[PDB]
């Protein structure tokens, strides 16, 4: 299971 | 800065004339991800060839497996033709 | 024994040809089990291994939304990197991410990963401590400052120590028939004369799983690392892998050469010779 990206670059 | 594909053409199992097998073309070590791969039967493009989902290695270089069901014979010659931004001409690797 | 779970993300811009495509693929060891492609007619997280099929509707619906939102984040990131690297809007660029965890035979965390590349070059990576970052250049330092201020590493650590380990443990159990089976290589040595005084000895390994393998040639019991042609391990398409190693030998000296095979599936390493 993968989650959302925590934060953008 | 781009990386040219390494190419291997081979069968799923050791080839036996008259026996159903799979013809593979494995492209690896390339960057960027866009690539063109054809499987050839006596110089002609094989239709509805399938491929694996885009993925990559620890070094970020991409890999793909192209494959199709085939029954090899003594007369039939198989190959893979590959085009990538790094190549001036498509590269043809024959199945041994 | 030991196992890994990995997700491989690839986002590629294509100026003039719509928005960047996003692909996410998931693996347990060398077995792919999920895919998402934003270019699919109806983008959705799809099963790619039989042991994941039992996951309920909540699994697929949650993962599809996560990948749809992620698709947008990577499009934003490709825009951001055009600014950080002072690039034009004309060219195609790529962002890649590898994330996952490794566990030992007891299922305990060995280590976690969260790393990214831009145009196939390292960009930013979460260090093994899961608390600090390695930025490849002054552009990745801007992301590092942004991620330190928002305590992003703490959030990544939580996923890697919890969710990642917990789900890898679940998948290994649900797929125990295959994920926890090592298929040893089927091996043989071929001989082909190249001329009157040289011949090729090729050592084959077929039908093995996992992909990790060591194939070597020795001459008089000495490793021939520099004189061996070693092809990359390649998938057969039926879950198994293949590899070969070849040496060019002087005619009449074939019996001085030995092929050595190491694989998880082998209780002891194999020694092979050309059997005329």
Author numbering:
A (entry chain C): 1 to 9
B (entry chain B): 1 to 96
C (entry chain A): 1 to 276
Task: Give passages from the manuscript.
Our previous work identified NP338 as an immunodominant CD8+ T cell epitope in individuals expressing HLA-B3739. Our conservation analysis of the NP338 viral peptides across vaccine and circulating IAV strains, including pH1N1, H5N1, and H7N9, found 16 natural variants of NP338 peptide, with the most common mutations occurring at position (P) 5, 6, and 7 of the peptide. To understand the molecular basis of cross-reactive TCRαβ recognition, we solved the structure of NP338 and its variants bound to the HLA-B37 molecule, as well as the structure of a cross-reactive TCR in complex with HLA-B37-NP338. Thus our data demonstrate that CD8+ T cell cross-reactivity in the context of NP338 peptide and its variants is favored by similar conformations adopted by the epitopes.
